[PDB]
């Protein structure tokens, strides 16, 4: 047997179905998602971090003159100042009061603590879903990590569930991402060998051990202080520490559909978005003959309470004189009402008890059972808290929520209104026709 | 803040964020008087109670404007032929239906 269903992509709410065949009793299909992941394949871009300004020993010579080296460390500058007369603790190190020259080096290279404090640039695409599904189906419960690409089944027990494609291709991350201090960011950096001076990017490496660096901080060499040994430089301040400084909240407080982002991997949690398709090939086995389950008569159902919150605010008690005990596959075909449990127990004679969920004012529904179709039917009322900390478990319907004075009122103002226009069109018709009779 | 039944979470400092969804108890009875039910659809729904009460008193208005209209045509029609007869004798329309 095939069937084809859909449910939606909540975290945490399980979702009921029900199985029918025309000579098989009805069986019941309870899946429960209790997690639901989205991994992007990223690939590391680069790796920035604080960078560190290197100067070599300033080379002075006494009474002569220098040349510049040809540069080659990454944003390695060399310059060579004449007429210094530098002093040390022993005293003037140069005999010339002119003609000394003193060669100044500098470069940038990666801080000691970029092994630890450090930020990885990736870009983000093609993203795959996971779901951890509970699925109960024929009194058969199992627990599966499931891929919600549509090409793979899982296989338990006979049973075939091919879960996907995804109803919605929409996903947090963007095509450029940030991981930093496990937080992810959505920041467009700047590739590779195209950073700039004191923005994020200043300084890029390809992998936290790589041996290459590309830095652009805007460093020049200054000259030095009259009778000091010493390289002075000006550098834009580190784009890494100003982007720490103005970072904006991480995509954890600002993702849409309350999804939770992780790393290791780079994971988004329970988005409440898009719809799961699920395909079961289910083997005859699990079937049962109508003979076989018990079959329901003389059941009537009395909402003893319902109030329309979000969760199960409605108990329906059912009133069943059945042929034999055994396992019922209640549920509810309508969308009125959702039913917290997907299987009740039967006995011969007795009362049952249901837990549903409805957004009705007035709810009227067919509560199907083992054969039977009882229709249940009462009135709810508004539960006490405004604000919940659950989502709801029913659906809203377009006229839930209208009572029964509203209908009435609509009914006399529109139901009224076109009796009028009749009994108008009625006098007109007759007034015309009398008149029409009158003139021969 | 406002909380619909979509949701709404908050991060107080170090706090574990905290989620909340809203729940249908809007001021007003639906089983009570016009007043009381128009507040509570009107604070439920907002622009579906407006668009549609208006659209409710329009065609209502409109329908009691062509009775009327209908109902002054048939009694012009019916009595006219009556009523410019020189010496004005109208007692079988007045007998039959009391129109005027
Ligand atoms: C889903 O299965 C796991 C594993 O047994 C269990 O811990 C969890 O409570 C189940 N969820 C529900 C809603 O029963």
Same mark, same amino acid.
């Given at each position: 047997?095939?069937?084809?269903?859909?449910?939606?992509?909540?975290?945490?709410?399980?979702?009921?179905?029900?199985?029918?065949?025309?000579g098989?009793?009805?069986?019941?299909?309870?899946?429960?998602?209790?997690?639901?992941?989205?991994?992007?394949?990223?690939?590391?871009?680069?790796?920035?971090?604080?960078?560190?300004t290197?100067?070599?020993?300033?080379?002075?010579?006494?009474?002569?003159?220098?040349?510049?080296?040809?540069?080659?460390?990454?944003?390695?500058?060399?310059?060579?100042?004449?007429?210094?007369?530098?002093?040390?603790?022993?005293?003037?190190?140069?005999?010339?009061?002119?003609?000394?020259?003193?060669?100044?080096?500098?470069?940038?290279?990666?801080?000691?603590?970029?092994?630890?404090?450090?930020?990885?640039?990736?870009?983000?695409?093609?993203?795959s879903?996971?779901?951890?599904?509970?699925?109960?189906?024929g009194?058969?419960?199992?627990?599966?990590?499931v891929?919600?690409?549509?090409?793979?089944?899982?296989?338990?027990?006979?049973?075939?569930?091919?879960?996907?494609?995804?109803?919605?291709?929409?996903?947090?991350?963007?095509?450029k991402?940030?991981?930093?201090?496990?937080?992810?960011?959505?920041?467009?950096?700047?590739?590779?060998?195209a950073?700039?001076?004191?923005?994020?990017?200043?300084?890029?490496?390809?992998?936290?051990?790589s041996?290459?660096?590309?830095?652009?901080?805007?460093l020049?060499?200054?000259?030095?202080?009259?009778?000091?040994?010493?390289?002075?430089?000006?550098?834009?301040?580190?784009?890494?520490?100003?982007?720490?400084?103005?970072?904006?909240?991480?995509?954890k407080?600002?993702?849409?559909?309350?999804?939770?982002?992780?790393?290791?991997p780079?994971?988004?949690?329970?988005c409440?978005?898009?719809?799961?398709?699920?395909?079961?090939?289910?083997?005859?086995?699990?079937?049962?003959?109508?003979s076989?389950?018990p079959?329901?008569?003389?059941?009537?159902?009395?909402?003893?309470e319902?109030?329309?919150?979000?969760?199960?605010?409605?108990?329906?008690?059912?009133?069943?004189?059945?042929?034999?005990?055994?396992?019922?596959?209640?549920?509810?075909?309508?969308?009125?009402?959702?039913?917290?449990?997907?299987?009740?127990?039967?006995?011969?004679?007795?009362?049952?008890?249901?837990?549903?969920?409805?957004?009705?004012?007035?709810?009227?529904?067919?509560?199907?059972?083992?054969?039977?179709?009882?229709?249940?039917?009462?009135?709810?009322?508004?539960?006490?808290?405004?604000?919940?900390?659950?989502?709801?478990?029913?659906?809203?319907?377009?006229?839930?929520?209208?009572?029964?004075?509203?209908?009435?009122?609509?009914?006399?103002?529109?139901?009224?209104?076109?009796?009028?226009?009749?009994?108008?069109?009625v006098?007109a018709?007759?007034?015309?026709?009398?008149?029409?009779?009158?003139?021969? | 803040?406002?909380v619909?039944?979509?949701?709404?979470?908050?991060?107080?400092?170090?706090?574990?964020?905290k989620?909340?969804?809203?729940?249908?108890?809007?001021?007003?009875?639906?089983?009570?008087?016009?007043?009381?039910?128009?507040?509570?659809? =009107?604070?439920?729904? #907002?622009?579906?109670? @407006?668009?549609?009460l208006?659209?409710?008193?329009?065609? %209502?208005?409109?329908?009691?404007?062509?009775?009327?209209?209908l109902?002054?045509?048939?009694?012009?029609?019916?009595?006219?032929? =009556?009523?410019?007869? #020189?010496?004005?004798? @109208?007692?079988?329309?007045?007998?039959?239906?009391?129109? %005027?």
């Open positions: 047997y095939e069937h084809a269903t859909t449910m939606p992509s909540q975290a945490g709410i399980s979702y009921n179905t029900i199985v029918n065949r025309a098989y009793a009805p069986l019941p299909i309870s899946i429960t998602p209790t997690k639901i992941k989205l991994i992007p394949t990223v690939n590391l871009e680069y790796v920035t971090c604080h960078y560190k290197g100067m070599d020993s300033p080379a002075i010579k006494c009474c002569g003159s220098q040349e510049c080296t040809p540069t080659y460390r990454p944003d390695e500058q060399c310059k060579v100042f004449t007429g210094v007369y530098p002093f040390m603790w022993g005293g003037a190190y140069c005999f010339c009061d002119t003609e000394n020259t003193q060669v100044s080096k500098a470069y940038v290279m990666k801080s000691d603590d970029c092994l630890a404090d450090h930020a990885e640039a990736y870009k983000a695409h093609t993203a879903v996971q779901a951890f599904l509970n699925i109960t189906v009194e058969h419960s199992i627990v599966t990590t891929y919600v690409n549509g090409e793979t089944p899982v296989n338990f027990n006979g049973v075939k569930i091919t879960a996907g494609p995804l109803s919605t291709a929409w996903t947090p991350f963007d095509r991402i940030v991981q930093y201090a496990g937080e992810i960011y959505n920041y467009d950096f700047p590739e590779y060998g950073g700039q001076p004191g923005a994020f990017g200043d300084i890029q490496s390809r992998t936290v051990s041996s290459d660096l590309y830095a652009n901080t805007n020049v060499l200054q000259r030095p202080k009259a009778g000091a040994i010493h390289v002075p430089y000006t550098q834009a301040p580190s784009g890494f520490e100003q982007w720490k400084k103005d970072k904006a909240p991480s995509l407080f600002t993702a849409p559909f309350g999804c939770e982002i992780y790393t290791n780079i994971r988004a949690e329970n409440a978005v898009g719809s799961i398709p699920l395909a079961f090939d289910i083997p005859d086995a699990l079937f049962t003959r109508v076989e389950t079959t329901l008569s003389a059941a009537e159902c009395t909402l003893n319902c109030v329309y919150s979000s969760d199960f605010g409605g108990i329906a008690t059912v009133k069943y004189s059945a042929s034999k005990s055994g396992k019922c596959a209640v549920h509810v075909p309508s969308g009125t009402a959702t039913l917290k449990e997907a299987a009740v127990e039967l006995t011969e004679q007795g009362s049952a008890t249901i837990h549903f969920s409805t957004a009705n004012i007035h709810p009227e529904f067919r509560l199907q059972i083992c054969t039977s179709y009882v229709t249940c039917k009462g009135d709810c009322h508004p539960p006490k808290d405004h604000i919940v900390t659950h989502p709801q478990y029913h659906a809203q319907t377009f006229t839930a929520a209208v009572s029964k004075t509203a209908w009435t009122w609509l009914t006399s103002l529109l139901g009224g209104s076109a009796v009028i226009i009749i009994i108008g069109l006098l018709t007759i007034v015309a026709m009398y008149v029409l009779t009158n003139q021969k | 803040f406002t619909t039944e979509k949701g709404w979470e908050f991060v107080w400092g170090n706090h574990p964020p989620r909340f969804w809203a729940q249908e108890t809007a001021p007003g009875n639906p089983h009570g008087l016009p007043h009381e039910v128009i507040t509570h659809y =009107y604070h439920r729904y #907002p622009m579906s109670t @407006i668009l549609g208006s659209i409710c008193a329009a065609i %209502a208005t409109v329908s009691v404007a062509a009775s009327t209209w109902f002054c045509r048939s009694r012009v029609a019916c009595l006219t032929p =009556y009523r410019l007869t #020189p010496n004005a004798r @109208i007692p079988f329309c007045l007998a039959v239906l009391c129109c %005027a």
